[PDB]
Each structure stands twice: as C-alpha cells, then as structure tokens.
Design a binder for this molecule. Structure first.
Ligand SMILES: CCCCCCCCCCCCCC(=O)N[C@@H]1[C@H](OC[C@H]2O[C@@H](OP(=O)(O)O)CC[C@H]2O)O[C@@H](CO)[C@@H](OP(=O)(O)O)[C@@H]1O
Lengths: 48, 28, 600, 211, 86, 327
C-alpha cells in the first residue's frame, strides 16, 4: 500500500564541539536521485 | 491449488457446508 | 552375495566377525571393512592390517563372491598415557581424564574417547579450536603400547553477535529470552547447547540447529547463528448445528500456545444450545518479569439444564522457577455451584447428610448451592528433550487444592501425573514409555469431598478401550428407570451409571516404534506404538455394611486392564490420536468401546 | 496466438487465475517464439499479483540468467525488489495492528540491496523515484530491529551488548529516527558501568542534537 | 528465591596477563598479549577498554576495568587499572 | 535371455550309466572345480563340504577332513600323492594307496585352481599369487606375483609353466626358480568391466579368455601367430588338428588350428550353461544345467539335478551332478 510513503524524512546528527561521530560504513547509503517519476498507485506497474 | 458440498482452500483452512453443519477451520 | 570369506582369521570364529557385517555395495563393503578394523583395534591388536580385498562375479553375473585377506597380530596392553603440549591450566582435569587401569587391554576407541573428552573439557572454557592429536609407541620386546597425546589449546574465543534465522512470526525477544550465552562475553560451548535445548523444549518449532562461524579477519571472535523452522501453533474453530429438532446450535473457539508470536498462551471457548451454555476464557503470560515469573488466569461459566447444574468462577495463578528444571505455582480461585432437582440416590445423599441436608427420599424436588473459595498450588519438573515427540528425560506434575476456611465446602484434592521415556536404539527410533497418574481427595472437619469434584477414569486419554468416564462405582438409587420413583420397583436398584470416586490410579506402558513403511514426508510427523494399560477408581467411606448386598466399592483391587495399538499424527490442523484396544479384563457394567479417536 | 490474446484480456480485464491458466498453457510454446520473453514477463507479473511469490522469484532469476542484458531488465530488477519486500508483510499482524519490525529482517536486507542496485544502475529509469521512497522506508525498518535488540539487552542487564549494538547503529544507520532515540541506552549503559567520561560524551551528543 | 542465570560481560582478564603490560608496547603487542578488545571509544580517540564484569546469581556484581590510552602513532601512553567498583 | 528348450532330436545312440553313487552333500550353487579323478582303476572324488572318497572302478575308502572345509581345486593324482585345495589357506596332501592324510600346508590364498603336479613341484594359482610347493612336503619353493583387476590352472612343458589370470596378459615362467620368462597381451575390451586355461600343443600356446581374443602364440616368446574373435571362460579341447570350443554363449563349434574358417557349429544348446567338452568314444560330450548329456546326434537324461567339468579316461566317462556317475 502507500504506508511506505509515510516514512519520516532522514536527518543527520550534528557533531558536538570537540568530538567526531563514528566514521560510517559504505553500505546503506542512499544516493541522490531526481525524483521525477510517479509514486504509489500512480505508477504503471506492468510489462512494458 | 484449490480443490473441491465442501472444499479445502490450502493448508491451514478447511470449510464444509453439508439442518445444517456448516463449519470451517483456520489454523495460524 | 553368495559367500563372504575371511582369510587369516584365527582369534575369532568366521561367523562372529560376519555377525557384524551389513552386506548380510561399495558403501556396505567399506562399512564392513571399517567395522572389522575397529573390532580388532578394540581388543589390543595394534598391528592389525587389512591386506587385500577381492570382489568377483560368477559366470554370466549369476552371483558374486567377496573375500577379505587380513593379518592378525597379538593382544597388546596399554602401559600408560603421556600428555604434553600447551595446557593453559586444566592439567589436573586432563590428568584425571588420562587415568587408565594398569595393564588394561589397548583399545583404539578408548583413545578416541579420551581425545574427545579433552576437546570437550577445553571447549567449556572458551578454547573453541584446540589442536589435539595422539599416537602410539608400539613396543616389540613386550606386548605393550605407550600412548602419547599432544595438546595445543590455541587461544580463547569471544562471541560478537547472536543472530536468528527463520524467525518470521515470533518476536526476537521470544527466542532470545531462552538463551544462556550472552553477547560480548567469553564463549562457552556448553551454554550454546543449553540454549538449543531450551528452544526445542518450547514446542514452537519443527527444528532448531546452530552454526558457530568465525568472524573474517579476527583471530578470536565468533558469531553464533540459530536456524529454526516454525510450526503452526493453534487453530480457530467455528461451527453451527441448526436443526428443527433442537433449533439453534452454536460452537466456537480458538486455542493458541503462541498468540501472533507474542508468547502468550490464549484459549477462548464457548457454546450454546437448547440445554447447555458454556464459556471459558484463559490467558497466561509466560514472562511477567524478565526472570521467568509467569502470571495468568481464567474465567468460566457452565449452565447445564439437563437435574439443574449451574456454576461459575474464576482462577488466578502465579508461578516461578526455582531451578533450571523446576518451577512452583500458587494461586487463588472461587467457585459458585448450584444444583437442583437431583434424583435421590445413596452416594449423593450420604454427602448431603454430612452437609446437614435432609431431603425427602424419592421426591426429586430439592435444591442445594454453595460458594467455595479455594487455594490452589503445585509443582512441575520437566527435562524432556522435545515438545512434540520427546525421546528422553521425564516429567512430573504435582497439583492440588485446599478449601479456604470460610468456604461452605471443606476438603482437599491432590493429583500426580508422571511420564518417563527411555530410548532403545541410539537413533531414538525405538523407545519405551511409562506413564502414570495418581489422585486422592478427601474431607476435612467431618465433611466429604463434593461429588461434583470426583475423579473419573476411562476413555482415550486414560485407559483406552472403555467408554469415557465409565470405570468405577455405579449409582445405587432409592425407590428413565421406574425405580427412580414410587411408580417402579419398591426397593433399592443398581444401575450402570458411572459416578466416579475419591481415589484414582492409572498406569500404562507403551513401546514406540518407527512406522513400518511410510515416505520421508511423514518421518517426523507420524509415530506408532503398542500399549498395555490398567487402572482403577474407588470410593472410600462406602458403607460396605449397610449395603452389603451390593458390590463393595471400597475395594481397590478391582483393576481394569486393556491392551492394543495406537497411532499419533501431527496433522497440519493439529495432533490426532487413533487407537484400538481389547479390554480383556473387565467387570460388571464396564461398557466397552474398541475403536477410539480424538484431537490432542 | 489465441491463448496469448486471451491471456492479455485476462490480464487487463479477466481473472488472475484465468490469466495464469492461459499463460501457463503457453509453456508448450517454442522457447524461441515471438512471445517467449513477453510471456515470461507476463508470468512474472501474474505470479506477483496472485501472491505466488516463490515462483515470481524463480522465474525472475531464470529470466535474468538467460538474458543478462535486455531493454527492460530494469523493470525486472524493480519487480525483484517488490517481490522480496512483499514477503516481509503478513496479513494477520497487519489486521491486529501488530508492530512487525522485530521479526526476521533477512527479506528487507535483500530487497534493500536490490533496490540499491536499481537506483545506482539506471538513474534515468522512471522507477527510481519510487525505489528511493522504498529505500528510505527499508533503511528505517532495519534500524528499528537493531533498536529492539538493544532494548532487550538493556532489560536483561548485558551492558556490553547494549554498548556495542548501539555503536553499530551509529555506523550503519546514522541519520534515521531509531538511531536518534537509541542514544539514551548507550548513555545509561556507560553509567551502569563506571565509565563516566563516555556517558558525558554521549550526553553532549544527545543535548547537541536535541529538538 | 527465583532462579537467575549467571551473567558474564566483557573480555576475560587475569593477573598473569595484566602484569604483562608495559609502557611502550605497540597495539599489536598488546592485542597479542590480551586479545581483541570488546569495547573501544568510537568518538575520535584511540582508547581501549578491557572490562571484566561478573554477576553470579543473586550475588554481588564484581568488576575490574583496565583502560589503555594510546598515542595516535600506535603507542601505549597511559595505563589506568581500576581493580573494583566504587 | 531365456534358455533354449531341450532339443526334440531323437537319440540315435544307446548310452547308459555304468554305475552311480551319492557322494556327500553336493557342490550345489557354489562354483568350483571339484571334479572327480581316476587313476589305476580307482576313482577319487570329493564334496565341497569336506568328504573325500576313493572307490574301485566298478567304496574302499572315505574320510572327512573337517573338524566345513570348503574344499575346492578338485582332485589330481600323480604317483603316490593326492592334492586337494580349499577356499581356506590349507592344501591337503594324502597318500594314493592308503587314503590317510599325509600332511597339510599353508598357501597364500584360496586354492581355487587345479593343483598341477609337474617336474617335482605342485603349482597352485590362488590372491593372484602362483606358488610352487614341494611334491613331497609342505615347504614353499617359490612364488610369483601377477597383476589383478575362478582362477585358471597352469600348464607345463619343457620345464616351464604357462599361466595367466583375470588381467589382460598371459605369462610364462621357469620351473627352476620364481623367474619370469615372458609376458604378452592376449585380450582387450571396450571397457574396464569387460576385461579378462591355456594349453600348449606342438610348441604352440593356445590362449582363451572371456574376451573375444582367442590367441595363438609362440611357446618360446610371446609372439602372436594369429587371433580370432572367439572367447569363452570354459575349458576347451585341441586335438586332431582341430580346436573344439564351447562359446561364451554356449555355442558348440570347431575350427582349424590355424584360426581359419569355422568348420561347423551347433547352436541348439544356446544359454543352456554347457560344461566343457570331453572327447569320449570318438564323440564330443557336453553336460547341461538340467542333467542331460549331449553327443556331438544323441541326448540322454542322467540326473535331473544338473551339473563341474566332465572327465574321461581309459574308456570311462565320469561326471558329477550339481553324486558321481560312470558311463
Ligand atoms: C518407570 C516407568 C513407569 C511404569 C512403572 C510400572 C510399575 C508401577 C506398578 C503398579 C503397582 C503394582 C500393583 C500392586 O501390587 N499394588 C499393591 C497391591 O495391589 C494388589 C496386587 O495383587 C497382584 O496379584 P493379585 O492380588 O491380583 O492376585 C497383582 C498386582 C496387584 O493387583 O496391594 C494393594 C493394597 O492397597 C495396592 O494398593 P493401591 O492400588 O491403592 O496402590 C498396592 O498398591
């Protein structure tokens, strides 16, 4: 259903002065995309 | 999958209709 | 195979060595050769060798012959065991495992057993990957062997993560609460197996297995993975039985031992017809607190209009473990019970007289009702290896009631269920099962235990082959049977109506065997057994004197016995039991029933 | 010929059981026929819509293995992502409103990986906006699982499992909501052990990132 | 009254190895002598924590804490040994 | 697949059994070479169970050597000694006049081959080792090892033996010592599972094996003179410049000694499990599994239990059923 469309937006933590947050791993990194397509029920899910 | 006054749906689910004795079972 | 010959045998008869062979083919031939080699290696023949094997066919492949040519030595004795290498302590325990009887006949199997015991000794302290090897020094001047063992403990391992796979329905906490190995602590090889046993004992899974995996790029850490496969746990049942003879007929209920994976045990039942209304609600939380304290209770209502029998009540029970295998329970309950229009009879009125009632003989117009508060308690012992089809261990379940002062009734009741399994074969396909039940209740302060709490026996759950609740004393009526009132017989009449009694004893012995023939699909779901069972119920305080013209129901020796064959199957829709028995020893009024079936 | 036209009408207007019956009837067609690949794609769609997910997975693996490159391979990968994510849901826990994040995450990890391959491999595809939304959902669904394990160990009292489990969350899921709410568990775990310098460091992170 | 399993946490320490540590050893020499730490400070510093904690059933909690601070060159510069909880 | 039926040919002869008697339990289903032997008008016989008999050529002696003995290798008689092998490690030597046991000796394996008495020693072909024993003692004189993947008996001439086993070669060795003279390939097949008694006539070695590689070789060296497709495990007869064979398929045939064109065959006994041929009264005689004797023109029933190699000497035909008969 559309429940995935209600997910909260992502937001990073700020580093407090004098500390560095752990260096992250390479995985689970979502790249930046244009976002130009349809979502949910609007998407034409069928054999092209 | 589906097969037959009574019928079975799949695993976990049976129904019978057969004054009346209509009943069914649904296992979790 | 037409003939298997052994060339060079002198210490044993050919038939004795052949008696261990499976050929009686490459896999069987290899098995027989290893069996022969071990057989000799267990009796001191340190130099035993298999020199050649010949396998050949007859002309036109009509038959086959097998010959093995062996060389025997002599019987060596083990002079001592030398242990060296890197022992990170534990030298005393290895030395204790190392002890042998002076001059004991050299035995290759015993050497392997000592080596494995050393690995298992080190494994419980976190040395998961030791190097252990042993080798003989075989002497010529005398028939002796000196055994050397070289041990290198390696290094201690730590557990980084415990993961679960196949956990699709249950909460991760429902599996994890049963572990004994902690994350972030030194590894112990026995704690992981105790965790495996506890996961099996719940009865929620068809199988549990484990994998201890090394962490890539780390010399001292492992991950432990448990793999499980869930079984269907409880079913919903609903149905209607409407007809013009009875009108509305309704039944419904649900039973789960795991409710949506939350760990709760929930049972809800109800039914309605023209003569009976029944309801039940029962909820139990196996872990009210993190340490294993459980809490639960039930409510019930039962209204039977036939005499009239109406009752209702509640029970609240708490329990807690005291050991790995023992738990205790205690709780409170309340019952209201109202009876009316009772058919006059001796066994019931004896009690009513003891309660201070004076009904008029042969007039069924009467009533009696009580409000009883009860204290419940019990204890349980359980070390069975499986929830569904246990193969080892035993179970004991002591339970009982005592009336709380201030109740209308004053009595106590005790029951004791036991069962023990013993395997016959190492694969646990052949097993022998003993089952017993005991029970006794009695009065306090001059009263008798109410007849609505009497014990009953007989039926597919107790002694097979008899109609349910038919074993035991039968009602003797005062003057539908005409003797029930003045319109019939003018004196006391006996009947076949079972009423139960104050004391019960039942026992059975079952031999559990593999299915003679069935596909592998059912290998873990269908199990068959042969059984012999017995039991008896008796009524203390029976007045054998006043009614000396009738059977004396106080005699406990009138044991009923039966035997037969039964099959159990964990159908996808629930456990089923089928049985057939012949009640070869029975008494007056025992109504037989030979083919019996029920849902577990 | 007639069977495929019928299957197309059943896919558009008719029953999914009739559509699959007609499509499976085409298993007797030549592997090289004009509709062989089109029929295989139609079967994958029909298997997904009928919830015959084990077969949608087998047919997709076969399709990709036999045609490593295809003008619509990105559609098939997107359907692979949906096929794995669909196994994570369950009707019974949904009906009663049960919070399912504690259950096994193996299927969510597989779907996350396949959607990631889709977004990186074909940035111009019309499916990457929806895959982006599902990637955000799955990342958060996994962080909730790691939180649940840290919460249980806090309750049992295994303070090192709690510290290491949260430290892991700070490396793999740095910006999700479950991570921002997990820090108090590390702040506590470093006080039940007498490690005051790190409880103070964590308290500074909690205050600096407070709402 | 109610049975509580024994809880162990942290890596295993012994006096025979704690006495082995000297100022000037490298991180590989220390890791070899004592093993891989289960706790470290992730927040931008090179510090290892060797925590030995035991909680026998219904007994008191006992803990030894050995903290090692290393220079960014990979050299041990400070040893701080707490033999017991306060 | 199935055995051919008994021929309908009318018996043109008047053969009869001169006498018969039971001997022990019988060989039955065990394949062995426990054939009878005749010397100096005394018949010697044995039963696999261990009974050994000697009878006049018309019951004078019998003993049981068992404590079964699983006797094999048959009975051979030469001068003063009788030699009986076994599937155990023992070889029994008995006196020929009095039947009392003379000695026993150990060998390297089952003595399945015929015990052959030649040039002062007894050749036993076992585990694939050929051993030469003292004709007058239990001592071992020498052994020779052969390759290995019943065992064929040796044949001797001019102080040397020709032997060979289930492997693809035939070898010739000296009798003075365990020294090899030569070896040669005689057989080959398309597969390892199909790869397998020699005679010497006028200096020509005639070798036969299961495989279709009937071969003639020089006695002095292993040079093949000719080879033919015919193969069989059964014993064969070479005489009159003709070779009389029983084929692997139980065809009965004869060819010339040069390996030339087949002279004649008779195929009406195919798959009847014929014995080796014996030449008696100018005719070839074979026994089948059903107890019939065939003359090659005539057939006669003797003993319905079936048959073990036939033997004949000094005008007598002696056969034994799967009990001994003399025709
Ligand atoms: C470990 C795996 C689980 C399986 C355990 C199997 C062993 C349990 C045995 C049951 C008790 C034997 C019966 C018995 O022996 N029970 C006492 C006795 O019973 C009269 C006896 O007489 C004999 O021969 P007969 O007299 O019939 O000719 C036949 C047996 C029995 O019938 O004496 C009564 C006094 O009360 C009993 O009392 P009670 O039944 O109340 O316990 C005793 O127990």
């Amino acid at each position: 259903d559309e429940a995935y469309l209600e997910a909260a937006p992502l937001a990073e933590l700020h580093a407090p002065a004098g500390m560095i947050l752990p260096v992250t791993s390479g995985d689970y990194a979502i790249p930046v995309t244009n976002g130009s397509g349809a979502v949910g029920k609007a998407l034409d899910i069928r054999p092209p | 999958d589906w097969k037959v006054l009574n019928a079975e749906i799949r695993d976990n689910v049976r129904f019978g209709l057969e004054a009346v004795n209509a009943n069914f079972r649904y296992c979790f | 195979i037409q003939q298997i010959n052994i060339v060079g045998n002198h210490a044993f008869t050919t038939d004795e060595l052949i008696s261990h062979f499976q050929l009686r083919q490459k896999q069987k031939l290899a098995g027989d050769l290893e069996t022969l080699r071990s057989y000799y290696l267990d009796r001191g023949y340190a130099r035993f060798n298999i020199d050649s094997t010949q396998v050949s066919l007859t002309p036109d492949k009509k038959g086959i012959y097998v010959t093995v040519n062996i060389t025997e030595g002599d019987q060596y004795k083990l002079s001592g065991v030398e242990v060296s290498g890197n022992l990170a302590g534990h030298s005393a325990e290895i030395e204790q495992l190392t002890k042998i009887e002076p001059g004991e006949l050299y035995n290759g199997t015993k050497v392997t057993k000592m080596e494995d015991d050393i690995k298992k000794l080190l494994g419980r302290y976190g040395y998961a990957y030791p190097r252990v090897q042993s080798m003989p020094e075989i002497n010529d001047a005398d028939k002796t062997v000196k055994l050397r063992v070289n041990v290198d403990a390696g290094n201690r391992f730590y557990v980084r993560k415990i993961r679960f796979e196949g956990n699709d329905t249950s909460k991760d906490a429902v599996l994890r609460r049963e572990m004994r190995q902690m994350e972030g602590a030194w590894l112990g090889s026995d704690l992981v197996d105790q965790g495996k046993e506890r996961l099996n004992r719940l009865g929620f899974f068809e199988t549990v297995d484990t994998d201890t995996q090394r962490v890539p790029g780390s010399p001292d850490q492992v991950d432990v993975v448990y793999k499980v496969k869930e079984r269907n746990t409880g079913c919903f049942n609903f149905g209607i039985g409407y007809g013009t003879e009875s009108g509305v007929s309704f039944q419904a209920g649900v039973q789960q031992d795991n409710w949506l994976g939350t760990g709760y045990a929930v049972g809800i039942n109800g039914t309605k017809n023209d003569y009976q209304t029944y309801a039940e609600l029962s909820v139990t939380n196996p872990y009210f607190t993190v340490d294993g304290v459980s809490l639960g209770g039930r409510l019930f209502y039962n209204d039977f209009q036939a005499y009239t029998n109406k009752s209702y009540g509640t029970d609240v029970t708490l329990g807690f473990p005291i050991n790995e295998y023992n738990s205790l329970r205690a709780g409170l309950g309340y019952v209201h019970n109202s009876l009316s229009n009772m058919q006059p009879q001796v066994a019931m009125w004896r009690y009513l007289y003891s309660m201070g009632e004076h009904p008029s003989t042969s007039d069924q117009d009467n009533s009696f009702k009580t409000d009883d508060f009860t204290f419940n308690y019990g204890w349980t012992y359980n070390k069975l290896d499986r929830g569904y089809f246990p193969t080892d261990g035993s179970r004991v379940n002591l339970t009982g009631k005592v009336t709380i002062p201030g109740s209308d009734n004053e009595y106590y009741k005790v029951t004791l269920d036991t069962a023990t399994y013993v395997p016959i074969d190492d694969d646990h396909k052949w097993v022998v099962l003993g089952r017993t039940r005991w029970g006794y209740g009695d009065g306090l302060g001059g009263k008798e235990m109410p007849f609505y709490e009497n014990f009953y026996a007989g039926g597919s759950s107790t002694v097979r082959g008899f109609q349910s609740n038919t074993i035991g004393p039968k009602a003797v009526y005062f003057p539908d049977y005409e003797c029930a009132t003045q319109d019939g017989a003018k004196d006391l009449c006996k009947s076949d109506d079972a009423v139960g009694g104050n004391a019960m004893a039942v026992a059975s012995l079952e031999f559990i065997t593999p299915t003679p023939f069935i596909s592998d699909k059912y290998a873990n779901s269908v199990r068959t057994s042969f059984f012999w069972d017995m039991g008896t119920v008796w009524d203390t305080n029976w007045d054998s004197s006043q009614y000396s013209g009738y059977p004396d129901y106080s005699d406990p020796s009138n044991i009923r016995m039966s035997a037969g064959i039964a099959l159990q199957w964990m159908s996808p829709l629930g456990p089923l039991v089928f049985s057939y028995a012949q009640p070869f020893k029975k008494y007056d009024g025992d109504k037989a029933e030979q083919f019996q079936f029920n849902i577990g | 010929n007639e069977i495929y036209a019928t299957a197309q009408q059943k896919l558009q207007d008719g029953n999914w059981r009739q559509a699959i019956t007609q499509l499976e009837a085409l298993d007797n067609r030549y592997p090289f026929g004009p509709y062989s690949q089109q029929v295989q794609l139609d079967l994958i769609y029909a298997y997904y819509k009928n919830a015959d997910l084990p077969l949608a997975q087998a047919a997709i693996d076969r399709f990709i293995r036999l045609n490593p490159t295809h003008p619509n391979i990105d559609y098939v990968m997107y359907m692979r992502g949906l096929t794995n994510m669909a196994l994570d849901d369950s009707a019974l826990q949904g009906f009663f409103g049960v919070d399912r994040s504690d259950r096994d995450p193996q299927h969510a990890r597989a779907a996350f990986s396949d959607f990631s391959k889709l977004v990186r491999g074909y940035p111009n595809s019309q499916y990457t906006t929806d895959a982006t939304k599902r990637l955000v959902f799955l990342k958060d669904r996994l962080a909730k699982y790691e939180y649940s394990v840290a919460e249980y160990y806090t309750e049992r009292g295994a303070w090192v499992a709690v510290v290491n489990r949260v430290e892991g969350m700070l490396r793999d899921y740095p910006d999700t909501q479950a991570t921002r709410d997990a820090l108090p568990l590390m702040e506590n775990a470093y006080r039940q052990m007498q490690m005051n310098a790190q409880a103070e460091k964590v308290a500074k992170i909690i205050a600096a990132n407070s709402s | 009254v109610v049975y509580r399993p024994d809880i162990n946490q942290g890596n295993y320490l012994t006096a025979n190895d704690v006495s082995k540590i000297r100022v000037g050893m490298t991180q590989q020499q220390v890791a070899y002598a004592l093993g891989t730490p289960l706790m470290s400070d992730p927040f931008g510093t090179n510090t290892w924590f060797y925590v030995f904690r035991q909680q026998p059933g219904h007994e008191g909690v006992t803990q030894q804490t050995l903290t090692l601070t290393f220079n960014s060159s990979g050299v041990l510069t400070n040893i701080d040994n707490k033999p017991a909880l306060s | 697949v199935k055995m051919s039926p008994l021929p309908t040919v009318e018996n043109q002869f008047t053969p009869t059994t001169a006498w018969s008697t039971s001997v022990g339990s019988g060989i039955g289903n065990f394949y062995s070479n426990l054939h009878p032997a005749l010397a100096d008008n005394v018949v010697y016989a044995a039963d696999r169970a261990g009974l050994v008999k000697a009878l006049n050529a018309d019951e004078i002696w019998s003993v049981s050597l068992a404590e079964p003995a699983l006797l094999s290798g048959g009975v051979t008689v030469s001068g003063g000694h009788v030699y009986i092998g076994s599937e155990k490690a023992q070889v029994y030597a008995l006196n020929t006049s009095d039947g009392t046991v003379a000695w026993q000796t150990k060998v390297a394996g089952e003595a399945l081959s015929r015990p052959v008495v030649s040039d002062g020693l007894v050749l036993i072909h076992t585990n694939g080792q050929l051993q030469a024993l003292n004709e007058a003692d239990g001592a071992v004189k020498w052994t020779v090892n052969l390759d290995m993947p019943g065992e064929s008996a040796p044949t001797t001439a001019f102080g040397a033996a020709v032997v060979g086993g289930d492997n693809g070669r035939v070898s010739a060795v000296l009798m003075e010592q365990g020294q090899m003279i030569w070896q040669q390939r005689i057989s080959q097949a398309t597969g390892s599972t199909e790869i397998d008694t020699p005679v010497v006539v006028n200096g020509v070695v005639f070798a036969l094996a299961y495989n279709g590689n009937l071969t003639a070789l020089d006695l002095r060296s292993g040079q093949i003179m000719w080879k033919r497709e015919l193969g069989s495990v059964n014993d064969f007869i070479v005489d009159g410049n003709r070779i009389y064979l029983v084929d692997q398929n139980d065809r009965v045939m004869a060819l010339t000694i040069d390996g030339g064109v087949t002279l004649w065959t008779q195929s009406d006994l195919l798959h009847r499990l014929l014995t080796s041929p014996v030449l008696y009264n100018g005719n070839l005689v074979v026994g089948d599994s059903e107890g019939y004797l065939h003359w090659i023109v005539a057939q006669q029933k003797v003993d319905s239990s079936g048959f073990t190699e036939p033997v004949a000497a000094d005008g007598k035909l002696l056969i034994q059923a799967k009990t001994v008969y003399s025709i």
